Design a protein around this ligand. Structure first.
Ligand SMILES: Cc1c[nH]c(=O)[nH]c1=O
Ligand SMILES: Cc1c[nH]c(=O)[nH]c1=O
Ligand SMILES: Cc1c[nH]c(=O)[nH]c1=O
Ligand SMILES: Cc1c[nH]c(=O)[nH]c1=O
Lengths: 247, 243, 253, 247, 242, 243
């Protein structure tokens, strides 16, 4: 009933699909697929909910990764085994630049590797870089609908809290490595924080797979640590139109 | 009304609970809670399904972490904010040692940190060590039900595939770091691979929180229903001793 | 300080004439060659490995300035050019391909680099990506299409050495340190296209300081192929790649 | 002599499989004299070794000297001769305000601020004590009623800069260790010593059992250098009683 | 035409020479060669300008390295391929000790490896140490020439700016690693900053080649960021090593 | 006592500013007896100290014990007492085929395969000897005409795995040191010992002068352990020239 260990999918389920949009939240999978033709549920196991749809007569996959590089690495590997060669990540993010605002769209060229899983594919010297065609499709999709878009570097962390230098926590402390880190990333022109791109981008770029990253800003970190739908469907429109250009 | 960002929980929802059993799978949460008194669902958001139960008159939490350290680190942190001081991880695992059989139970004293999230709490030099009281309770709970128990070191990987030196993959490649690594860990007496303990154990030991881990052996790299059941019985009985 | 705003280059802001883009080759001797593809080229200065020319491209001032070999001298050039007012840097180089199906004469556009250098660490920790600017990479790819080249786009290994860091054994010692033993096979398996010696420094220092940087190179040798092209290894292939960097510069002014 | 440094043969051990390993060669006789039939074996460099009897079974007392390097020599050569269990008894400086001078500390695992541990396992490997050894130490501490704390110990290759002592010739502490004591204090680290990271790592990665017990001779929240027999006695009584349980 | 990929030299060009003086600046190669007998220009390609000369009847090479370890590693390797076994570097430097003056001559015993190229020959644990005979010749040559000389450790950086903790820059900031680094090296007794010695000394010491390092102080960094005995010393030292 | 470990006051030194520092406490008396007016000062742990006189000037002989940690204590506390120059005399295993047992090896700088050196300076800092001390050692070796080799030493925190010895309890060497001896050998490294990296780093980064000399007792291209005076004579003569 399955060709892979976790996803609960066969090659036949994909119907020859070579592109997957990979959100974090299993609940957003249906919402992304509903914007394409002939959307249908495939499987749901753990944090891995998968749907198949169609764009311009070509099969497309939407599959959730869950939170973090570890679960992402499972999803991407098992989709690759099934035939997916192009991965488009759609996520939510916290901006660290003063002039990147809530509701803005961010396209990641490459990520700061503040994760562990990327090291299981390539040494730290290797860049967590997005594919050129994917990044191009994402930027061009963003411009076609008139989104406020920033293109550049993202910091990709294995934690929501200390690795993103949040202090409103149980301990209230941040380990030496990350103490004063956000200001440093800010000075280096890093746009934002998320949790999956370093793993996704490194594992694709070091294994002959294409990957792209687009995200909607839901909090600005120069203002607050914790965020307070419209930003969602903005970036979701982008990832689907970008997918159309990559089939 | 939620006090935390991900778990969708308030401090009131815990009803004074100070201990949590933390399985990986959201679907396993109810199964663990059903072994205790007055089980009720609290919340379900993404990979974080939380139930509350009662054990000898005291409230306990059962909450899933999802796969991997990042997701675990969110669950543990937010449960700690809500008042949880003790964390008991329960799971099923493979084995990398020939002498460990399918049906044996593993109690982890400390973990090899093949993860990234642990480094966000303490530098690599810091040991990913389990709490002594927790480990004791798990060992003595295992001995009380007659389980064949192995106590020692676990390798905690950020990946299911290359970090556990699996070649049956898309690339068929394992990066230099992990090339020949399983045989290395085997020679060092490492019992098994899993994917959450390095993060759990490091973040707890470096923040004044108690943590332990028990796991049932369901497969062996070198070489059923009851094994799952035994490991759960052990973790619930261990919880009784730590309340 | 004989009319210089900077320590090494021997240049003033007036020399730039409002220029905000620089083409940065490695060889001082190639600077005149690159400027010759533009309007009204004039020599500005020559100090150490830093030879610089100003030219005009579609009516706009542009700088060509050599970096020398390696991250250290590249870091001096880029920094002092930034002090002078340059915000966009386009590196044109020669390279040895490591993939069997990238042929001699092919053009390579670098999206990002494996940091086998030391100078990039002086600008950002290793975790930071040695990534090229999107607009620069776009301009190079589009220009490659305008010229009509066989072009490959992807990752480059940027080494602090020509010999052991590129796993060459044809050396005095004949040995390669543990770190780089079997490294070329590893990079090949990771889809890395080629070796050069400046991009990791250039890309990291620009991306971490609000400067735009692109990287393009002509393939003059393939490490997997027995046949090594005649002494003019550079010549015709380099002219092809040089035409692309100049055409790319037009779209970034 | 079967071993290069210790000057011992397999016959000298008389089938002994457990060793109590103090730091000071001058402490070896005093520990052996607490057991039955104490006999001197050898004395070379900082390695003074004695044999004794505990409930009819041969036990070894062998000094390690200061630090992991000399500790690693003693442990290895003792392992070559047949020892499978090592119980370290030491002196320590507490860094938590609540641990008093004369208290007893049982180490579950160590912060690896040494170099020798890396010669047996990479840094990712835990410098963790054996569960049975640790249990024996904790329970022996309960039986004599000593004020005991159980937890993590920072194991340093230096007495001075690595334990953030400033009252030195240079008065300098390298960046790595600047502010490090406060960091360890916040992480719940009980104390500093100089041998356990090496001992615990080399044993846990080679199938050997190791425990660690120590007496507190100074509290670092008060002073850098210690000023008294009451401290040593309890700790030494614990290690001998723990050895009984592990034969 | 050339037996090496970059320098544009044949083995015959060297005329049996086994020692090279290796300055950073190609423009200063002629100057150094002019101090010896029978100076003859050999080649000029990229940052590599080379001259041959004679010293007490023996052939010697002067060959520039350009700025930094990578270009230095090229020059040294290819010169080694052509038979050179001893390398004497002469450079300029910024002193970081208050007692070291502009015009003073610094002889390097070993270098702090703030470069990347050294790691391509030996792991970081390996010392960037100078050859004992070369260091001795430089110290004795300094006595012969007459200069205020200091002997000790040098910090060798892959950058002129952030790695030497310079703030007179475009960004005016320094990465975490190098924030407060100069005063740290200062307290550790490090004499000076340059950009080639770590690569040179490591690659030579780990490959059976002999290397020495001498430099003239052009700026004192306890005072400011912005800035011929050394030359006479390197030539005299070469006399002693033939 | 002015210091915590050595059991000495500044008075015990009689104005001595140079120390010869062997590893074996049993060796201290033997070295001091080669000089004038030898007097025992103290013996605590692995730290046996004697005072002697050389050309009418007070000199200290003090043992370090084995390894960087104990060496770092001896050097630091001697520095506090007034010593500014340290000459280490050790025993060593050669790794080059043409170095004979009994040969004298003078260390210019050391490969830092230790941990204690990092407590004084980051890894980038060279474990280099003092020029005057090295010169005195080389020139002293020349004077008595001993077979001498000058160069780089590998200084290891272990005797066994870090020096790639396989005739051990486990018979294994961690990945980092597998094939390491061949690598050091190809790099021209002369020998292995266990103290110089720490000694040389801590002195060079703290304004103290240090020299390093050793006698070869085994050749590692032939055997791991030997079957089981010139270097000693050289260290005493070198000390004469540094007063
Ligand atoms: C041909 C060539 C040029 N430049 C490099 O860095 N490597 C190479 O192989
Ligand atoms: C062994 C030891 C004793 N006392 C301390 O304060 N620190 C140590 O490391
Ligand atoms: C070569 C050089 C000269 N002056 C400096 O201040 N730094 C350097 O690196
Ligand atoms: C001290 C010593 C002697 N002999 C060796 O072979 N190695 C060492 O480290």
């Amino acid at each position: 009933k399955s060709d892979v260990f976790h996803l609960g999918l066969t090659k036949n389920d994909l119907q020859g699909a070579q592109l997957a949009i990979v959100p974090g939240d299993p609940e957003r999978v249906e919402k992304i697929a509903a914007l394409m033709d002939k959307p249908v549920k495939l499987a749901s196991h753990r944090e891995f909910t998968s749907w198949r749809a169609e764009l311009d007569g070509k099969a497309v996959i939407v599959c959730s990764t869950g939170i973090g590089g570890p679960s992402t690495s499972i999803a991407v590997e098992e989709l690759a085994q099934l035939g997916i060669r192009t991965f488009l990540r759609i996520g939510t993010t916290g901006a660290i630049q003063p002039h990147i605002n809530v509701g803005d769209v961010l396209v990641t060229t490459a990520s700061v590797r503040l994760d562990g899983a990327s090291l299981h594919f390539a040494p730290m010297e290797f860049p967590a870089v997005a594919d050129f065609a994917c990044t191009t499709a994402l930027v061009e999709a963003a411009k076609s609908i008139g989104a406020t878009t920033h293109v550049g570097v993202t910091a990709s962390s294995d934690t929501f809290y200390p690795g993103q230098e949040r202090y409103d926590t149980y301990s209230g402390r941040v380990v030496r490595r990350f103490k004063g880190s956000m200001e440093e990333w800010q000075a280096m022109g890093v746009m934002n924080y998320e949790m999956e791109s370093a793993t996704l981008l490194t594992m694709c770029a070091s294994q002959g797979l294409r990957a792209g990253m687009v995200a909607g800003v839901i909090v600005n970190r120069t203002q607050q640590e914790i965020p307070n739908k419209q930003t969602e469907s903005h970036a979701v429109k982008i990832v689907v139109e970008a997918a159309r250009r990559l089939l």
